Amino acid sequence: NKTVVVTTILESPYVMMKKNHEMLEGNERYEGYCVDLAAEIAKHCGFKYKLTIVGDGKYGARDADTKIWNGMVGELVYGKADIAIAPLTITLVREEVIDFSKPFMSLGISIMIKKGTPIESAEDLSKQTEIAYGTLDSGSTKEFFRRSKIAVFDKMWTYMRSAEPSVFVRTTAEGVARVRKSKGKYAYLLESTMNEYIEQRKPCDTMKVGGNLDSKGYGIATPKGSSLGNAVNLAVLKLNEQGLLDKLKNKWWYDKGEC
Amino acid sequence: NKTVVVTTILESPYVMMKKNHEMLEGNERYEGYCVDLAAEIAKHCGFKYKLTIVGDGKYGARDADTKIWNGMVGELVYGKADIAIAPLTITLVREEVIDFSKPFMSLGISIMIKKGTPIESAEDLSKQTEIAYGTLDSGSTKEFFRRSKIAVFDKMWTYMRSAEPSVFVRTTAEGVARVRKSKGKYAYLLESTMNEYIEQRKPCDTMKVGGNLDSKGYGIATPKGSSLGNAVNLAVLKLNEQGLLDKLKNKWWYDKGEC
Ligand SMILES: N[C@@H](Cc1nsnc1O)C(=O)O
Ligand SMILES: N[C@@H](Cc1nsnc1O)C(=O)O
Ligand SMILES: [Cl-]
Ligand code: NA
Ligand SMILES: [Zn+2]
Ligand SMILES: [Zn+2]
């Protein structure tokens, strides 16, 4: 009968600081796709909640040496949060330590280029060197390449892990900025959802090119064995069938379009 | 320990009888995406299985009066099958009575028209009468239109439910044949997966038009509480991350392509 601690991450357009946040308190300080989703899930599940941005600003990965989980996954694993409502990718290694609802959004790894870049696919990136390319420093995308057995992807990984300086970035915003200021000499591998979002934001100079490299989804996560998981899983399905999710995506992705 | 009874359905290209099937026995009589998926899953979960075609040839719905489930879901809820490996859509009503693995395939409801039919969208079908349209007699698609609040879809449901003669079909093949021999006076609403497949088969006279009406996925189902569920779910995720599911999709949809 207590307030649910929701761990989430500052990633546009999922969770963003409201323009006048410093004059607001609690949940009213945030806005975005996941903020709207959180209010809906909590309303349909009947619980009070509190949104908290993940301290280290990470999604979640296990450190090879210490074996400790960081990011939003870590907050769930070590009991700091009761639930995670964010663009957290459903992956095998995560599913082994936390529970995931059925996906509320479908997506895939994609390529983000500065308009004009002579690249139309991952294959293209692999068969050249002039243009550098990387992914987020930790998360499902980097893990995807590091584990792939498909020649093209494995080849891109061989290059990325040894590239110097590092082609990996700490945050999505860091990757987008790097694409924008690299005169077309840097491409960024990120999930199609974020790629499509950025493509509709000023200065409208980036572009999603080629098809997705894979298919997967984002799910609402809870600690392994949490009682909350069952209800939340059922709420996601109901909200999807009633069109809420489609409406929310259009709202934050296209209605707000700047291009 | 014991051979796992797999319930499935004859739906191309998921499960199909091989050409020389009469000379074969057991699982060897079948071929297809789901047949391969089944083998893979059984290999990684370590068990023997028997493929059985669902008796009433239905996906699964609950009779409003008797409250009895039919089709594959019915076989699972009543203990006739241990698992269902087929293109069974993850939904709220089904999730309430059976367990679903994370989706092994993403899809949406789509429109199939005979080439040349003057229809580009759902809205187009709703604003006219000359062209009849309907869905599978029972399944997630028919349910979607019945539980739809969206004006366009709702309007389509009113027409379909009252239409005469009936526009609903017992099987997808029947829906497809109806479109093909109706001079374009009938459009069939079915899942994008089947639509895309048919679009690539002779006589090559059908088309998937417009975008998907919704987003959802297929999941491997198991009786609620089943022990096999956990391992199967982790296996689906493993196969997706290794690229196998993408491989099978290309193999059965486009490598086989005839148009
Ligand atoms: N959604 C990913 C992080 C991410 N966002 S864009 N590229 C990425 O890797 C994760 O949940 O780890
Ligand atoms: N996959 C659906 C049936 C179906 N296949 S193509 N159009 C449809 O409605 C179900 O699982 O009920
Ligand atoms: Cl046997
Ligand atoms: Na109505
Ligand atoms: Zn395998
Ligand atoms: Zn009845």
Swiss-Prot record, chains A, B:
<feature type="modified residue" description="Phosphoserine; by PKC">
    <location>
        <position position="148"/>
    </location>
</feature>
<feature type="site" description="Interaction with the cone snail toxin Con-ikot-ikot">
    <location>
        <position position="238"/>
    </location>
</feature>
<feature type="binding site">
    <location>
        <position position="191"/>
    </location>
    <ligand>
        <name>L-glutamate</name>
    </ligand>
</feature>
<feature type="binding site">
    <location>
        <position position="140"/>
    </location>
    <ligand>
        <name>L-glutamate</name>
    </ligand>
</feature>
<feature type="binding site">
    <location>
        <position position="94"/>
    </location>
    <ligand>
        <name>L-glutamate</name>
    </ligand>
</feature>
<comment type="similarity">
    <text>Belongs to the glutamate-gated ion channel (TC 1.A.10.1) family. GRIA2 subfamily.</text>
</comment>
<feature type="glycosylation site" description="N-linked (GlcNAc...) asparagine">
    <location>
        <position position="1"/>
    </location>
</feature>
<comment type="function">
    <text>Ionotropic glutamate receptor that functions as a ligand-gated cation channel, gated by L-glutamate and glutamatergic agonists such as alpha-amino-3-hydroxy-5-methyl-4-isoxazolepropionic acid (AMPA), quisqualic acid, and kainic acid. L-glutamate acts as an excitatory neurotransmitter at many synapses in the central nervous system and plays an important role in fast excitatory synaptic transmission.</text>
</comment>
<feature type="binding site">
    <location>
        <position position="87"/>
    </location>
    <ligand>
        <name>L-glutamate</name>
    </ligand>
</feature>
<protein>
    <recommendedName>
        <fullName>Glutamate receptor 2</fullName>
    </recommendedName>
</protein>
<feature type="site" description="Interaction with the cone snail toxin Con-ikot-ikot">
    <location>
        <position position="62"/>
    </location>
</feature>
<feature type="site" description="Interaction with the cone snail toxin Con-ikot-ikot">
    <location>
        <position position="146"/>
    </location>
</feature>
<feature type="modified residue" description="Phosphoserine; by PKG">
    <location>
        <position position="182"/>
    </location>
</feature>
<comment type="subunit">
    <text>Homotetramer or heterotetramer of pore-forming glutamate receptor subunits. Tetramers may be formed by the dimerization of dimers. May interact with MPP4. Forms a ternary complex with GRIP1 and CSPG4. Interacts with ATAD1 in an ATP-dependent manner. ATAD1-catalyzed ATP hydrolysis disrupts binding to ATAD1 and to GRIP1 and leads to AMPAR complex disassembly. Interacts with GRIP2. Interacts with GRIP1. Interacts with NSF via its C-terminus. Interacts with CACNG2, PICK1 and GRIP2. Interacts with GRIA1 and SYNDIG1. Part of a complex containing GRIA2, NSF and NAPA and/or NAPB.</text>
</comment>
<feature type="disulfide bond">
    <location>
        <begin position="204"/>
        <end position="259"/>
    </location>
</feature>
<feature type="binding site">
    <location>
        <position position="141"/>
    </location>
    <ligand>
        <name>L-glutamate</name>
    </ligand>
</feature>
<feature type="binding site">
    <location>
        <position position="89"/>
    </location>
    <ligand>
        <name>L-glutamate</name>
    </ligand>
</feature>
<feature type="topological domain" description="Extracellular">
    <location>
        <begin position="118"/>
        <end position="259"/>
    </location>
</feature>
<feature type="site" description="Crucial to convey clamshell closure to channel opening">
    <location>
        <position position="119"/>
    </location>
</feature>
